[PDB]
Design a protein around this ligand. Structure first.
Ligand SMILES: [Zn+2]
Lengths: 349, 1135
């Protein structure tokens, strides 16, 4: 593939006009690669011309697919592109990366076939520390932190984050609001909230699986989490990292219903039913699941809990195990330890 | 299109940096304070601090260090504005013209670069070869110091260590070497670089890097002979000198982190250290190792000098006097009498400068006058949190009341053996003269033997040489002191009526016709030794001595003031008093810090003048409208030294700090005549007689503002005034250490545990919950309260303590529905540290009756109640993100009525009428309207813009003022006349400003007597507001023409007034944000406009060349150079 080393950074609040490929119809958040292959000769010629000129494309995500009208979009830059003539058809494969968000002021259809639109590149505004305005001259030296201790041995990390919130937001006593409020508007605290809450749905190591820049982290988590398209557009509307993270928290806390991973429809449990009696998530109740095998209590991880295999009703694939009590006077009687990897989650509708 | 006018009614009081040196002179020991845009220069003295000059600079001060380059005698001053407006000032005085000239100035900002999280740091080479600056991370900026460096050209130097905590220059080095501590993933190290100006880059340092504590905080360079540097952290103090290394880990500094330091000995043998919580250590260096002549250390002992205010910047004066500044407490002067040791503490407080900041919340209360409000701010924090009461002007505490038929004159009378006690009060009607002798509180009238019955008395005094004179219209009658009988009488030679009379201890002069007669009082007799004729009729006269060097008389037919020798007709000088009207009264005294002479015109003006001891006359032309009526001036002994009472339509005690005079208006509706009252039963009183009745009493003070303090020893949060019960309501939060056995121990005895009836909340409506992470020993927990404070005694009557782990946010006192009582309603919010967003909350409704706080109703909401207001008897609370409107049922139980769900955090609530304004920290201002017919909320307009908003306020149904990030202000106006729905659904932004102070709360009202006399209004409102530093501003609307005129005048002033440091005013007030900056529009700087009266008359003449200050008919473009003064005076009266 023909590699490209240049980087495009248009001026903020500066109008730009560029054609939009009709093939792209989904919402592409900045930082998320969206490879696409075009076989139309006109599309191939337009892609070649764009690569020669500035290697820039516009992906206008229409709010309604049938209406084909887009009030928002994203600008993408081609990183590596390959032009292979397979079966006599001009096919170009390019792996592009998003550059910046754009607002489509007006959409027009060019004679050649592409759609020409003039879009002003919206800016990514970064706010300073919320405590910088009222920060004390004596206490600036205490802002620098004693490294960032982190380990699975620390587990909860309760004390370190309590010290962080207590001393970083020390100056909040001079303002009418308390420190626990500003912690909801702090980039690091929110980033920790996503990172800890994500690990409840997967075993990826948060140290390197996600970036450290708040903007990059926000874009990555917005792309990764399962969500519909309208709420993707709503997130794309937000132009502030802190506001975007808060919106992501608001969306995330509403995913109260889990479901079979490669099954979509079959719900397995509710977040309110999670009974953390004693890894794998523990659920007091379950639904749409069938027991498998026999209660072979041999080498049971939970003493007194005879474990039996369980599977999705719609797939028969294993989703967890049913920890049945090994004694009559044993509580809980039955705890369902569903596997963490096997769950979507999804909205409660 | 906004037309607002922001003015400062109180200078900022929080100290944010202090320094000492030789600045005003080569021998004085000065003390400079940034408080915070205001630089205060003092001279240290054995008695205390003597102020020298106030100076307002167009910028927030962040660096302040004195240096003495080669050749100069008195040290210069380097100031770096927070906006990066550097300058090198220098004190310069020529007799009287004390001016802070700017030797060099410039801007050191860079186009690209994120400001360092550790903030601006400014350090100076000890040899004064250059100035260091760390403005941006990984970029050390150097400003070389030379006689030809006027633009302050600075060249950056790259730093590899991005995270630098503290950097300071070292002593005793050939080249300028810096020493700093930087944070890296390995830990915290200390590194030294040698700065070379030829190479414009660093080099190898004197001694190599080392390792220090994981939380080492600050670097404190030690001077010659010791050299080296000391690094103090949270656990130990380490001294580095290359191959020499000392470390000490005292167990005293473990409690708190050292934040500020100081040096006391010139050779660095001793040091001061003040930690966060407010105690004052003292570091001592042991120089007992003189191995080879050079001095080297042996021990690093540490001591403790006790507890003081919460220190933010120490400084050491002479003879063991330490000025402990404080950003949130009260600035103190503590004496280090370390040889006394009264109770284990070493410090002893001497002074305490008032500090209103920080202000968290306030309210306007009608306390005494019933026509003017008073401001009740919840000042302070931590262990200094306290209430403050602010009122305008002095007040007189009346001791007696009596009614007379429009008294038109009064004078003390003494008819007893001389004991400095007056037993008789001599009144004077239009024609009658009632001599009331009252040893106690008698009202009967008993004419004296020498006192006439009805003669329209013009004077009634106590003459010397055993006499008591009573001069009337007909003739002056002398009554002997001990005989108490009339023994002398000297009628006019022509037997005419005397108009103006003056009574002195041994001299008496009356005005007969156009001539002046002087009579000298002898033992039981009077002799006239002087006689003269004036060109015109004498309007008034006053001779204030034994022998008066000179006497003054006003020409009624010439409207001119002249002075002459008292015992002769030898004139000294004369001047024209404008010619408007004949003077009403003239007097001279030491009230204005000098032997000044004041003359009051019939138009209510008061032209100040300055006299001398033997013979001296000046002009001092200044026409200040003290009143709108003729004014009688009299001086009373019960004052600071003498003061002057300028009785008029608005009586004022004419004050002058040491050289500048300001009329401090008294809190009285109107006064016609006054006189001092020295009664045995009412000492140091002041008999004030108005057009209705008369009264006597003592004065409070002579300060423009009186700030009463009510210490609480705990941080207050909110406040309200409940009128019916005549008491306040204030929250609080006291920090208590976790007990080893399970519980909490109070740190200090505060005002929450010392109340009369202290209850504890027990309504466990919300309970159970989880707290798996048990609070370990030594942890801090906040316990909230609700104090009830009586208005006129300020003593906490009740202290209701809330539940555990419950946080109170809102507080409102109002009546609901048809209920006739008034309830305290507090919206609290549950919290644990494990959960981020609270999920449970309470809306409790108290009622303070019969001295007991009894809960009336209770309601639990799934969320946190942030703010609450009142609608026509309906309570509105904003839970988390929603907005809920409650109805107060007849059975005393809140009932939800209608809900409105927002995607933002409904955090700021301010309303009027029907429109509802909602916002949050991210400046997502939103609007709502409540239609009674539907009984449901509706959205009118929205405005979203990412920024750290601070507070919001309603100015009117159209304008929505509010502060925001980077200390700015803004005004949002809705275009209700828009043609389409979308255009009227968006909030336009019209006003912008750079106040420079972080606003905290907004409240309607004003601290001025708005009781009556609204002779129209240029300004159309008043919105007070406090800030973190302490100032109390006032934002008031204006008309279009007035705004345009003031904008023109403001733009004309900037070309005349010289700013200290030569910072352009448009740049200082420009709307500043970290990412963008645009000029301020729609606001008028109150400080600059009111400065128009300070500049001299010629400067005013150039300022007013065109083209306004008159009505539309003609517009009088000349403006006469005085029409704008009348405009400014009207604008000054608002605050
Ligand atoms: Zn399935």
């Amino acid at each position: 593939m023909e590699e490209f080393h240049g980087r495009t950074l248009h001026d903020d609040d500066s109008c730009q006009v560029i054609p939009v490929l009709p093939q792209v119809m989904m919402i592409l958040i900045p930082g998320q690669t969206l490879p696409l292959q075009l076989f139309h000769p006109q599309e191939v010629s337009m892609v070649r011309n764009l690569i020669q000129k500035d290697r820039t494309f516009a992906v206008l995500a229409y709010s309604n697919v049938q209406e084909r009208e887009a009030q928002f979009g994203t600008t993408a830059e081609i990183y590596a592109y390959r032009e292979e003539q397979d079966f006599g058809i001009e096919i170009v494969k390019v792996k592009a990366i998003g550059r910046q968000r754009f607002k489509v002021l007006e959409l027009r259809t060019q004679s050649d076939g592409i759609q020409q639109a003039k879009v002003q590149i919206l800016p990514e505004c970064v706010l300073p520390s919320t405590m910088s305005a009222v920060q004390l001259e004596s206490l600036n030296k205490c802002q620098i932190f004693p490294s960032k201790p982190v380990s699975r041995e620390d587990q909860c990390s309760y004390k370190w984050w309590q010290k962080y919130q207590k001393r970083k937001f020390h100056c909040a006593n001079l303002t009418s609001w308390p420190r626990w409020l500003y912690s909801l508007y702090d980039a690091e605290t929110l980033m920790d909230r996503i990172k800890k809450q994500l690990r409840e749905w997967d075993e990826n190591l948060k140290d390197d699986s996600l970036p450290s820049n708040p903007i990059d982290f926000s874009y990555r988590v917005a792309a990764c989490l399962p969500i519909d398209d309208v709420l993707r557009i709503q997130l794309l509307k937000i132009g502030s990292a802190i506001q975007r993270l808060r919106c992501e928290l608001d969306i995330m806390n509403k995913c109260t219903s889990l479901c079979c991973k490669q099954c979509q429809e079959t719900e397995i449990t509710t977040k309110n039913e999670i009974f953390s009696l004693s890894e794998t998530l523990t659920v007091y109740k379950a639904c749409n699941l069938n027991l498998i095998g026999r209660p072979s209590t041999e080498h049971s991880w939970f003493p007194g809990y005879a474990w039996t295999v369980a599977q999705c009703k719609i797939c028969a694939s294993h989703i967890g195990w049913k920890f049945t009590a090994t004694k009559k006077d044993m509580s809980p009687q039955k705890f369902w330890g569903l596997t963490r990897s096997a769950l979507l989650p999804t909205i409660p509708d | 299109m906004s037309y607002n006018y922001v003015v400062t009614a109180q200078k900022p009081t929080a100290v944010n940096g202090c320094v000492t040196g030789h600045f005003t002179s080569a021998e004085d020991l000065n003390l400079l304070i940034a408080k915070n845009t205001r630089l205060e220069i003092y001279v240290v003295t054995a008695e205390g601090l003597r102020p020298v000059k106030e100076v307002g600079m167009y910028g927030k001060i962040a660096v302040m260090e004195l240096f003495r380059p080669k050749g100069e005698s008195k040290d210069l001053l380097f100031i770096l504005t927070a906006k990066y407006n550097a300058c090198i000032l220098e004190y310069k005085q020529s007799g009287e013209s004390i001016d802070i000239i700017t030797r060099a100035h410039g801007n050191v900002q860079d186009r690209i670069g994120r400001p360092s999280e550790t903030g601006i740091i400014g350090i100076i080479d000890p040899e004064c070869r250059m100035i260091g600056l760390r403005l941006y991370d990984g970029l050390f900026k150097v400003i070389p110091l030379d006689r030809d460096n006027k633009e302050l050209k600075a060249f950056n130097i790259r730093l590899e260590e991005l995270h630098v905590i503290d950097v300071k220059f070292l002593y005793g080095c050939q080249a300028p070497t810096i020493c700093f501590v930087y944070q890296d993933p390995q830990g915290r190290h200390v590194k030294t670089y040698e700065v070379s100006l030829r190479e414009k880059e660093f080099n190898k340092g004197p001694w190599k890097q080392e390792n220090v504590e994981a939380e080492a905080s600050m670097v404190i360079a030690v001077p010659e002979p010791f050299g080296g540097a000391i690094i103090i952290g949270q656990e130990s103090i380490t001294y580095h000198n290359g191959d020499k290394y000392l470390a000490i880990a005292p167990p005293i500094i473990k409690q708190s982190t050292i934040v500020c330091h100081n040096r006391v000995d010139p050779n660095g043998s001793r040091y001061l250290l003040g930690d966060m919580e407010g105690r004052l250590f003292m570091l001592l260096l042991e120089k007992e190792e003189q191995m080879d002549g050079t001095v080297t250390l042996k021990d690093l002992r540490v001591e403790l000098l006790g507890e003081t205010s919460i220190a933010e910047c120490l400084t050491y004066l002479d003879n063991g006097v330490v000025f402990v500044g404080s950003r949130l407490g009260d600035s103190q002067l503590v004496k280090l009498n370390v040889d006394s040791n009264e109770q284990g503490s070493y410090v002893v407080a001497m002074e305490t400068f008032t500090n209103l900041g920080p202000i968290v919340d306030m309210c306007v209360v009608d306390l005494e006058r019933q026509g003017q409000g008073q401001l009740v701010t919840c000042s302070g924090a931590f262990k200094e949190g306290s209430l403050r009461i602010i009122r305008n002007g002095i007040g007189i505490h009346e001791h007696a009341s009596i009614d007379l038929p429009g008294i038109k004159g009064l004078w003390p009378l003494r008819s007893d053996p001389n004991r400095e006690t007056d037993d008789t009060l001599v009144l004077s009607f239009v024609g009658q003269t009632r001599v009331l002798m009252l040893n106690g509180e008698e009202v009967e009238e008993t004419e004296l033997m020498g006192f006439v019955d009805d003669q329209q008395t013009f004077f009634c005094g106590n003459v010397a040489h055993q006499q008591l004179i009573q001069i009337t219209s007909a003739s002056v009658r002398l009554v002997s002191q001990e005989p108490k009988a009339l023994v002398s009488e000297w009628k006019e030679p022509q037997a005419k009526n005397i108009s103006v009379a003056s009574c002195n201890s041994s001299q008496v002069v009356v005005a007969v016709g156009r001539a002046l007669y002087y009579l000298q009082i002898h033992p039981q007799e009077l002799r006239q030794i002087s006689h003269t004729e004036m060109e015109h009729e004498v309007a008034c006269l006053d001779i204030t001595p034994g022998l008066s060097p000179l006497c003054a008389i006003g020409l009624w037919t010439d409207i001119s003031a002249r002075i002459l020798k008292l015992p002769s007709f030898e004139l000294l000088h004369k001047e024209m008093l404008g010619g408007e009207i004949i003077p009403r009264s003239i007097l001279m005294t030491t009230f204005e810090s000098s032997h000044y002479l004041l003359c009051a015109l019939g138009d209510g003006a008061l032209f100040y003048f300055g006299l001398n001891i033997e013979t001296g006359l000046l002009s001092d032309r200044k026409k200040v409208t003290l009143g709108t009526q003729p004014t009688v001036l009299r001086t009373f002994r019960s004052l600071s030294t003498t003061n002057v009472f300028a009785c008029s339509d608005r009586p004022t005690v004419i004050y002058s700090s040491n050289h500048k005079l300001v009329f401090s208006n008294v809190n009285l509706k109107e006064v016609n005549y006054m006189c001092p009252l020295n009664s045995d039963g009412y000492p140091d009183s002041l008999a004030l007689a108005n057009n209705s009745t008369l009264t006597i009493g003592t004065i409070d003070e002579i300060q423009k503002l009186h700030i009463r303090t009510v210490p609480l020893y705990e941080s207050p949060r909110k406040i309200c005034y409940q009128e019916v019960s005549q008491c306040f309501g204030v929250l609080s939060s006291r920090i208590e250490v976790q007990d080893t056995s399970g519980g909490t121990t109070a740190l200090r005895p505060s005002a929450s545990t010392q109340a009369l009836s202290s209850s504890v909340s027990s309504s466990k409506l919300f309970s159970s919950s989880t707290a798996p992470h048990e609070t370990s020993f030594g942890e801090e927990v906040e316990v909230h309260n609700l104090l009830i404070i009586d208005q006129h005694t300020f003593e906490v009557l009740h202290a209701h303590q809330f539940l555990q782990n419950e946080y109170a946010l809102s507080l409102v006192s109002c009546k609901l529905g048809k209920d006739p009582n008034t309830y305290f309603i507090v919206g609290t919010a549950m919290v644990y540290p494990e959960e981020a967003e609270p999920k449970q909350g309470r809306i409790v409704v108290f009622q303070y009756s019969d001295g007991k706080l009894q809960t009336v109703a209770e309601k639990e909401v799934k969320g946190a109640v942030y703010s609450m207001v009142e609608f026509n008897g309906k309570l509105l609370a904003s839970i988390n993100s929603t907005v809920r409107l409650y109805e107060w049922t007849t059975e005393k139980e809140l009932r939800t009525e209608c809900n409105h769900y927002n995607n933002i955090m409904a955090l700021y609530l301010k309303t009027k009428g029907d429109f509802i304004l909602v916002g949050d920290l991210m400046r997502s201002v939103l609007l709502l309207a409540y239609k009674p017919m539907e009984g449901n909320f509706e959205e009118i307009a929205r405005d979203f813009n990412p920024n750290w908003m601070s507070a919001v306020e309603i100015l009117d149904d159209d304008n929505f003022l509010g502060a925001e990030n980077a200390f700015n202000l803004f005004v949002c106006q809705k275009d209700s006349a828009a043609t389409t729905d979308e255009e009227r659904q968006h909030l336009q932004e019209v006003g912008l400003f750079h106040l420079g102070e972080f606003v905290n709360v907004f409240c309607h009202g004003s601290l001025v007597m708005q009781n009556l006399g609204e002779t129209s209004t240029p300004t159309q409102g008043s919105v007070l507001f406090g800030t973190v530093n302490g100032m109390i501003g006032l934002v008031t609307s204006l008309s279009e023409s007035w705004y345009n005129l003031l904008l023109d005048m403001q733009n004309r002033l900037n070309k005349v007034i010289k700013s200290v440091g030569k910072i352009e005013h448009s740049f200082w007030r420009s709307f500043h944000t970290e990412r963008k900056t645009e000029p301020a529009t729609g606001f008028i700087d109150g400080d600059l406009i009111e400065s128009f009266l300070d500049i001299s008359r010629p400067k005013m003449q150039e300022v007013v060349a065109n083209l306004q200050y008159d009505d539309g008919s003609g517009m009088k473009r000349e403006a006469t150079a005085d029409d704008l003064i009348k405009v400014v005076e009207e604008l000054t009266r608002i605050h």
